[PDB]
Design a protein around this ligand. Structure first.
Ligand SMILES: NS(=O)(=O)c1c(S(=O)(=O)C2CCNCC2)ccc(-c2ccc(C3CCNCC3)cc2)c1-c1nnn[nH]1
Ligand SMILES: [Mg+2]
Ligand SMILES: [Zn+2]
Ligand SMILES: [Zn+2]
Length: 231
């Protein structure tokens, strides 16, 4: 009941929320097509460093994110992974790069970001091109579930905490619509969610790309949202 909501975060400010020991989500707000949306990413403690998952959706929000991390946590962000190519995940990569953060994404995400005219993470993450692939990256596992919200979407698991960050492939429980589906695969999405359910059955916290964290129920709910959109 304490997770910050969209009307509680002015555009340009970033909040952190402690999910588990050494795991936080970051919450920002941004405008798109004349509507304001909240957006989540993840921060995971990596020894005496931090791993960031996704930008705070924009250059100014991402600079505010780094400032918030500096005062709340006080460990340097050394690496960042973007979970798909859209602006709410890569917008702000140039700010990260100018702050010395090494930025990463799969080759699928990098090609799509390039074609879109979006900011491009510096480094390529191999070993994630086939559905069901998983690789280790510091304190997380990166998992490619197959096409869903986008063809390149990744999800992230924190094994020490049983936290699953779904990004935009996973919707919050209150969701009644599927968001931006222009690059989605509506037919494959439920199958990709089933793959996540099969691979991470011990997940205790599931974090969506937008909105409130919950439990494993966010996965089935997301498949249901997608089916309602298709119908
Ligand atoms: N990940 S993106 O598709 O580009 C994306 C962007 S975006 O700005 O990055 C991109 C910029 C270029 N033109 C297309 C949009 C914006 C809004 C949204 C957006 C987010 C949530 C929602 C609703 C909120 C109420 N509950 C149901 C979901 C609606 C929209 C998304 C998104 N992310 N995930 N799905 N869509
Ligand atoms: Mg309150
Ligand atoms: Zn997206
Ligand atoms: Zn999104």
């Amino acid at each position: 009941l304490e997770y910050p909501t969209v009307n509680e975060i002015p555009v340009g400010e970033v909040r952190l929320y402690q999910i588990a020991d050494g795991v936080w989500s970051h919450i920002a707000t941004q405008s798109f097509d004349g509507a304001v949306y909240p957006s989540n990413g993840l921060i995971v403690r990596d020894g005496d460093e931090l791993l960031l998952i996704d930008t705070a959706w924009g250059a100014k929000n991402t600079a505010a994110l780094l400032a918030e991390i500096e005062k709340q946590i006080g460990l340097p962000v050394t690496r960042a992974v973007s979970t798909h190519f859209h602006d709410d995940r890569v917008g702000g990569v140039d700010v990260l790069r100018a702050a010395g953060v090494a930025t990463y994404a799969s080759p699928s995400t990098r090609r799509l970001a390039e074609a879109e005219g979006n900011e491009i993470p510096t480094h390529s993450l191999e070993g994630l091109s086939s559905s069901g692939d998983a690789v280790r990256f510091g304190p997380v596992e990166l998992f490619y579930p197959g096409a869903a919200h986008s063809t390149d979407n990744l999800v992230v698991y924190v094994p020490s905490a049983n936290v699953l960050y779904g990004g935009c492939a996973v919707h919050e429980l209150s969701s009644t619509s599927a968001g931006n589906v222009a690059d989605a695969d509506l037919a494959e999405w439920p199958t990709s969610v089933e793959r996540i359910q099969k691979h991470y059955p011990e997940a205790e916290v599931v974090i969506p790309g937008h909105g409130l964290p919950g439990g494993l129920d966010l996965l089935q709910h997301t498949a249901n949202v997608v089916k309602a959109h298709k119908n």
